[PDB]
Design an enzyme around this catalytic site. Structure first.
Site, PDB file in Angstrom:
ATOM      1  N   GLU A 157       0.822  -1.177   0.000  1.00 51.59           N
ATOM      2  CA  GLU A 157       0.000   0.000   0.000  1.00 51.59           C
ATOM      3  C   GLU A 157       0.886   1.269   0.000  1.00 51.59           C
ATOM      4  OE1 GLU A 157      -3.017  -0.274   3.136  1.00 51.59           O
ATOM      5  OE2 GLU A 157      -4.425  -1.032   1.658  1.00 51.59           O
ATOM      6  N   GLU A 233      -6.569  -7.439  -0.393  1.00 48.45           N
ATOM      7  CA  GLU A 233      -7.095  -7.490   0.942  1.00 48.45           C
ATOM      8  C   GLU A 233      -8.594  -7.133   0.914  1.00 48.45           C
ATOM      9  OE1 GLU A 233      -4.819  -4.870   3.404  1.00 48.45           O
ATOM     10  OE2 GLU A 233      -2.911  -5.567   2.622  1.00 48.45           O
TER      11      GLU A 233
END
Length: 581
Positions: A157, A233
């Site tokens: 991320e 995710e």
């Protein structure tokens, strides 16, 4: 050799595949249980398991590499292979994940001139050295070498933290050289800033989200129009900070989003499929713009398996959806792992922490108070001690700054607590004696793992002062609580607002999973046969600590509880947890 690739869609072994992956972290379940959990995921219908790699676990001190026990990633991965799962590895080096310092070792903090997660020479040198070791272990496990590892993530991320393309490129190249032809990829939130910051030229991108898959995939398609869609995710659950209500999400809710994903020909990685536990001091933290927020011990996450590994309503619900989209075998689960109550354990022995310092620490000296990392300490508590000369009278004591909580004593008397969340960094003291011995017991409640305040020194960051006067000439006792064997105990007095170790014996006929109910107590940690369970705090929502059976033995078992403030005579072992008060 098998290779995962893609064109319109993922391909493996001459065929289209949809990746149905479940997140499970080796570092969050005791090794004895890895097979059990993995068998459960396979049973749900996952074809893949995904794990982060925790650098801090592997290189706890610089140059000291650890791949044993709960840290044996090789064993974990071989287990996945045995059970028949593909494996995705997400090596960071920063993994976020709600884990101490986002997986960074504490010792990064003392590297001169370091800057994290950017194109910085000192930082990259550390990553390179670590990666050299880590990949050497992983290499036999690569699909290109016949192993189960089909893909790896490059950062995590990144777009949420930075935009340093040189860094990402260096990382991509660095991983590439240490692997084979495995698929490399990134993940980010589905927002323009994140995608712009976090994508790497030449590298497949995935997104992470909890809801609104159509929107999320649409955003992704603006940057990456043709490639297969994957939610790396899918936050089908969530995690807790101390003082919060326990987070849960219904099966109905999870299904709705999962269908949204699947109908778009999406692949998915459930975060978390099995969550498990932040044992010891390994929990992470967050910071909003105002407050520091420590993540709790349990990482149950409202996962498909409970913290102790039980299947759940969500698990069946998800399996049922999977059945619409892939053909699966008859469900066959392992026999459930028994849970037992063991009843009350009385604490007959006690020891004051301040009365035990050389028993569990070695003093170090410095002119000014330094944060614990400077004393070589990653985790736990640290006592800072100095003598004030002269009767100052009434003074405001300020700890600048307190990371994250401390208990203050003057001449062996308790004066109060200082807390990070702020205004709370000052106490009034009255120094009427000729000399005053000042002691501050500081707790590192967990290093921040996400956002802009990640450079998170623990202890006392700068100084301690009375008014504007800084105090100098310190003695400090680092208390990582790794080896308690030298402690000795009496049945003697116990004082409120002083930390004490309390010692008891649990007699066990046969070891079984169990939970310690700490609802009576206030704040602290617990050890079972030397195994550090984690932290407890009356504020909740968690009020029990999971004890895996492997921590126990037939016969007598040593229970040691360190309580910070308010003391009691016993604890009780129960057969079900309280995660949600």
């Amino acid at each position: 050799m098998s290779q995962l690739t893609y064109d319109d869609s993922f391909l493996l072994d001459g065929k289209e595949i949809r990746l149905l992956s479940g997140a499970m972290h080796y570092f969050r379940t005791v090794p004895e249980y890895w097979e059990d959990r993995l068998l459960k995921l396979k049973a749900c219908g996952f074809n893949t398991v995904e794990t982060y790699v925790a650098w801090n676990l592997h290189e706890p001190e610089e140059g000291q590499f650890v791949f044993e026990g709960i840290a044996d990633i090789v064993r974990f991965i071989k287990t996945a292979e045995k059970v028949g799962l593909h494996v995705i590895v997400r090596p960071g080096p920063f993994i976020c994940a709600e884990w101490e310092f986002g997986g960074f070792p504490y010792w990064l903090l003392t590297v001169p001139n370091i800057k994290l997660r950017c194109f910085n020479q000192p930082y990259l040198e550390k990553v390179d050295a670590y990666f050299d070791v880590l990949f050497e272990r992983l290499r036999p496990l690569l699909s290109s070498n016949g192993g189960p590892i089909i893909a790896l993530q490059i950062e995590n991320e990144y777009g949420s933290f930075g935009n340093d393309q040189k860094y990402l490129q260096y990382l991509r190249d660095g991983i590439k050289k240490r692997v084979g032809n495995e698929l490399l990829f990134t993940s980010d939130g589905p927002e323009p800033s994140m995608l712009s910051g976090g994508m790497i030229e030449g590298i497949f991108e995935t997104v992470n989200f909890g809801s609104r898959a159509e929107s999320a995939f649409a955003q992704l398609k603006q940057y990456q129009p043709n490639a297969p869609l994957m939610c790396m995710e899918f936050w089908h659950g969530w995690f807790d900070h101390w003082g919060e209500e326990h987070h849960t999400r219904s099966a109905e809710s999870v299904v709705e989003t999962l269908e949204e994903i699947l109908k778009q020909n999406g692949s998915v990685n459930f975060y978390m499929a099995h969550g498990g536990t932040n044992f010891g001091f390994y929990n992470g933290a967050n910071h909003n713009e105002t407050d520091y927020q420590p993540t709790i011990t349990s990482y149950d996450y409202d996962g498909l398996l409970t913290e102790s590994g039980d299947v759940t309503e969500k698990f069946y619900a998800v399996r049922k959806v999977f059945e619409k989209y892939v053909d699966l075998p008859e469900l066959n689960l392992p026999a459930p792992i028994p849970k037992r109550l063991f009843g009350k354990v009385k604490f007959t022995e006690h020891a004051g922490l301040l009365d035990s310092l050389h028993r569990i620490s070695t003093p170090q000296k410095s002119e000014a108070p330094l944060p614990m990392e400077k004393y070589g300490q990653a985790y736990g508590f640290i006592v800072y001690e100095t003598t004030i000369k002269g009767a100052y009278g009434k003074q405001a004591l300020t700890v600048q700054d307190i990371h994250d909580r401390g208990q203050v004593y003057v001449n062996g008397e308790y004066v109060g607590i200082v807390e990070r969340n702020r205004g709370c960094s000052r106490l009034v003291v009255e120094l009427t004696e000729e000399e005053s011995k000042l002691q501050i017991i500081v707790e590192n409640m967990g290093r921040i793992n996400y956002g802009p305040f990640v450079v998170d020194y623990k202890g006392i960051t700068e100084g301690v002062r009375l008014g504007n006067q800084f105090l100098f000439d310190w003695t400090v006792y680092p208390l990582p609580l790794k080896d308690l064997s030298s402690l000795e105990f009496t049945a003697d007095e116990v004082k409120e607002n002083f930390p004490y170790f309390h010692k008891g014996i649990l007699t066990v006929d046969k070891a079984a999973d169990t939970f310690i109910d700490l609802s009576e107590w206030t704040k602290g940690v617990v050890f079972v046969n030397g195994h550090h369970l984690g932290r407890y705090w009356e504020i909740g929502p968690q009020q029990t600590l999971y004890v895996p059976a492997p921590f126990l033995q037939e016969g007598e078992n040593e229970i040691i509880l360190l309580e910070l403030h308010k003391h009691h005579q016993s604890v009780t072992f129960v057969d079900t947890p309280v995660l949600g008060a």
